[PDB]
């Protein structure tokens, strides 16, 4: 149950950030520095990622909602495709504060995302003159801005995966509100002792989010 650092080399997973503002707790993983980025060897991060290879299966097989967040720049379409194969929805948008504990925010996000969108999909769009087009700026713009995708989901997920909690301080506190566990790809720029997993990965290379997010939601497939 391993797709290891023997193939995680060039796609850009096991690398740090620009070698500044790193964190002193996380030094037994990230060692070297040259040409702008830290480079991570195969010593601990292989079985460290194999831990997630065990537990994403274990959380997946009990039949609960999963959640991925790919807000970061080269990481939206991975959470798209692995939300498709995972089955539960994607978060690919800049993160909105106040998500979980406020009901009618995401509930009205459901009702205007799809239910007032039924007015678009039925005989209300073609019966109103040009003043409905700005109503479709609220619809045709504020639906995919305030997208969510949460209308499939009737109850809080099992896992809150995230490309970067250091860029995503917000839902990390929302997930540690009522007790939902998290998964992330946490690099040198964060101290992941609150995070359940240590995945030393960055975004803007070619296939880091593709590999790690791929076999994570594959573990969700065999969990489902």
């Amino acid at each position: 149950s391993v797709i290891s650092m023997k193939q995680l080399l060039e796609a850009g997973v096991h690398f740090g950030h620009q070698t500044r503002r790193w964190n002193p707790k996380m030094k037994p993983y990230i060692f070297t520095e040259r040409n702008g980025i830290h480079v991570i060897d195969l010593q601990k991060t292989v079985k460290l990622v194999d831990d997630a290879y065990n537990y994403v299966k274990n959380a997946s097989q009990e039949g609960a909602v999963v959640l991925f967040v790919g807000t970061k720049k080269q990481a939206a379409e991975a959470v798209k495709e692995e939300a498709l194969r995972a089955g539960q929805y994607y978060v690919n948008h800049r993160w909105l504060g106040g998500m979980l504990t406020n009901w009618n925010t995401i509930q009205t996000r459901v009702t205007r995302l799809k239910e007032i969108n039924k007015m678009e999909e039925e005989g209300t769009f073609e019966v109103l003159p040009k003043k409905e087009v700005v109503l479709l700026n609220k619809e045709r713009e504020r639906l995919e801005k305030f997208i969510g995708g949460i209308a499939d989901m009737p109850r809080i997920p099992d896992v809150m995966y995230i490309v970067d909690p250091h860029a995503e301080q917000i839902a990390v506190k929302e997930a540690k509100t009522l007790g939902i566990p998290v998964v992330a790809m946490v690099d040198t720029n964060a101290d992941p002792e609150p995070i359940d997993v240590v995945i030393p990965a960055n975004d803007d290379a070619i296939r880091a989010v593709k590999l790690i997010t791929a076999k994570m939601a594959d573990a969700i497939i065999e969990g489902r």
Partner: protein, 159 residues
């Protein structure tokens, strides 16, 4: 000065403490230049002085400022409110006198972390440039992938 309008508007008028009004506005005529118009407008009521309203308005030749203020005693309202007119002119010193109060951007690569030269195929696809501004992680230094016009993976490379 020029003109008054003395007005006791609930009780009759008595020119001892009204003369005391006339003398503290005599000290307005120590702080005058043209005492253009004033007006006393006072009000005292029943129930053993649960108020003491007084007023004098101040249309001077440039500024206007009234005073409908209170104390328990009407004598104390003449006292503290005309002393309030003194301290108002003390506020009106500087408010009166002191009309003077006295191409390509010359910059480095905007990205932070280094990306290898194979990632430049994705880094050109990252932000939407035909080149890929990325400090090379695989190659020692800087590398970038262009777009050759034939349609293959180009390389803007000193190499």
């Amino acid at each position: 000065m020029i003109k008054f309008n003395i007005r006791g508007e609930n009780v009759e008028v008595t020119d001892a403490i009204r003369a005391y009004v006339e003398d503290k506005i005599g000290k307005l005529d120590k702080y005058f230049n043209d005492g253009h118009e004033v007006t006393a407008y006072v009000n005292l009521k029943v129930y053993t002085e649960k108020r003491a309203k007084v007023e004098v308005t101040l249309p001077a030749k440039n500024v206007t400022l009234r005073a409908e203020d209170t104390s328990q005693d009407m004598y104390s309202s003449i006292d503290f409110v005309e002393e309030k007119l003194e301290r108002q002119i003390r506020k009106y010193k500087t408010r009166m006198n002191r009309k003077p109060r006295n191409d390509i951007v010359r910059t480095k690569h905007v990205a932070l972390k280094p990306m290898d030269a194979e990632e430049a195929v994705l880094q050109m696809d990252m932000l939407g440039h035909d080149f890929y501004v990325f400090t090379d992680a695989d190659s020692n230094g800087t590398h970038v992938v262009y777009r050759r016009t034939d349609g293959r993976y180009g390389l803007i490379e000193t190499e």
